[PDB]
Design a protein around this ligand. Structure first.
Ligand SMILES: CNc1ccccc1C(=O)O[C@H]1[C@@H](O)[C@H](n2cnc3c(=O)[nH]c(N)nc32)O[C@@H]1COP(=O)(O)OP(=O)(O)OP(=O)(O)O
Ligand SMILES: CNc1ccccc1C(=O)O[C@H]1[C@@H](O)[C@H](n2cnc3c(=O)[nH]c(N)nc32)O[C@@H]1COP(=O)(O)OP(=O)(O)OP(=O)(O)O
Ligand SMILES: [Mn+2]
Ligand SMILES: [Mn+2]
Ligand SMILES: [Mn+2]
Ligand SMILES: [Mn+2]
Lengths: 224, 224
């Protein structure tokens, strides 16, 4: 029975390790509580980041669809290493778009700073990496902070997603960005300007907000 | 020892039941195994659908953020039962977006017809129901077909997903679609046209493909 008792726990360890990989800590437990209630938690202030590969579909002429997924897995493996180093939250991946959130599931007041350190690190990572044909991997990166709702929707193939205004403006900060830069709205610049160094881009038209003044994040302030 | 076995059996069962709903079973094993290969399998003939709710962010003015998440779970959970009815593959609910696939894991000659019957059924069920404020639920829908790659990318937050040209043009079919219509490209039209009624929209600009002749799925043909 020991040859089965040890194997049942070895299979439990593998199962728990997968669930852990796919879901944040508290979320996996909530989904095993066998609570019929839905997971929708309000968060007062979180920072969200989107990073998106510049001209990914043009690569479909020189690269096969399977090698493009092998590319994504390689590049995301490098980014996943970086999210663990910074202790942040990877939410999801939408093709060539990588979403990282700071301040969920465990809220933290320095969310903005931590994501800003992350974005600058991510910039240095992609800058060092080559696509399937030895060429560079250009990125558009945008951030935003604010009230968000995080939770799990649906009965199958579910994940912990986050919804809110800050995901909507961070999405625009990324799409409206010039390749190689980290774009932030006026609201985040206000949060960052004390510890970070930023360059004013100017006015920008948002797809659902209107017109905003934007800033580019270049690095931490010199400690001297 | 007696009470120890009683709880440990149940805990093992929670993880397995949770895990069962989270991924296709054989990909969960490939993920629990020590394989260094990319979980990426090529599939020839698959149809992909993208749905997205029209003006979701604006509903936050009348509905609380958590009731919006509860709504998304009520709405897409209803469609989750419709995918099963049609024997298709739900990929995810991301933001207010939904991805359903036809032709993975098992290939079916009617992959395009089965997903077209599903989208039309989905458009009828959405039309028959209200949002929490009592207003209608207008959707944008896009469909496409062709060779696809299905699997998992990255080392953290494993999620079973689908990539390819079909998922690229289905997302553009949805984003560029008029509200309440189901948009498909010329290639998809050419597949459906002998069992379904289609109306040409015409040549429209789509990102990464140029100018495409698009159509609107209207409904099934009168079998006399
Ligand atoms: C033959 N095409 C592919 C083969 C293998 C893997 C991916 C593709 C592919 O075309 O991926 C694209 C979308 O399907 C894929 N994609 C986007 N959203 C989703 C999504 O939500 N799900 C999946 N599975 N794939 C998605 O991302 C890719 C890039 O989309 P963007 O919209 O970001 O544009 P871009 O070419 O990079 O130029 P630009 O953005 O700088 O203007
Ligand atoms: C204050 N906003 C909210 C409060 C509670 C619940 C949801 C929201 C909200 O705005 O959710 C949006 C994103 O935060 C949330 N979201 C989560 N992840 C993502 C993501 O990766 N991308 C985007 N764009 N949005 C995301 O999805 C939601 C819908 O996004 P869309 O841009 O598709 O819809 P729309 O702009 O309302 O209308 P239309 O253009 O479709 O007509
Ligand atoms: Mn891109
Ligand atoms: Mn993208
Ligand atoms: Mn929407
Ligand atoms: Mn969306």
């Amino acid at each position: 029975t020991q040859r089965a008792e040890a194997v049942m726990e070895a299979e439990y360890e593998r199962s728990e390790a997968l669930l852990a990989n796919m879901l944040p800590g508290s979320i996996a437990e909530r989904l095993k509580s066998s609570s019929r209630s839905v997971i929708a938690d309000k968060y007062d202030e979180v920072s969200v980041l989107f990073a998106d590969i510049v001209g990914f579909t043009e690569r479909a002429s020189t690269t096969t669809p399977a090698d493009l997924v092998r590319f994504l897995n390689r590049l995301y493996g490098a980014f996943d290493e970086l999210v663990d180093k910074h202790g942040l939250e990877k939410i999801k991946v939408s093709g060539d778009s990588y979403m990282v959130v700071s301040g969920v599931p465990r809220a933290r007041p320095d969310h903005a700073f931590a994501l800003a350190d992350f974005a600058l690190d991510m910039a240095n990572v992609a800058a060092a990496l080559k696509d399937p044909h030895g060429d560079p991997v250009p990125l558009r990166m945008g951030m935003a902070c604010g009230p968000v709702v995080a939770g799990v929707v649906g009965s199958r193939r579910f994940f912990y997603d986050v919804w809110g205004d800050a995901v909507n403006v961070a999405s625009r900060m990324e799409s409206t960005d010039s390749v190689g830069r980290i774009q932030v709205p006026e609201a985040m610049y206000e949060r960052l300007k004390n510890e970070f160094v930023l360059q004013e881009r100017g006015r920008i038209e948002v797809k659902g907000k209107g017109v905003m003044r934007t800033w580019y994040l270049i690095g931490r302030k010199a400690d001297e």
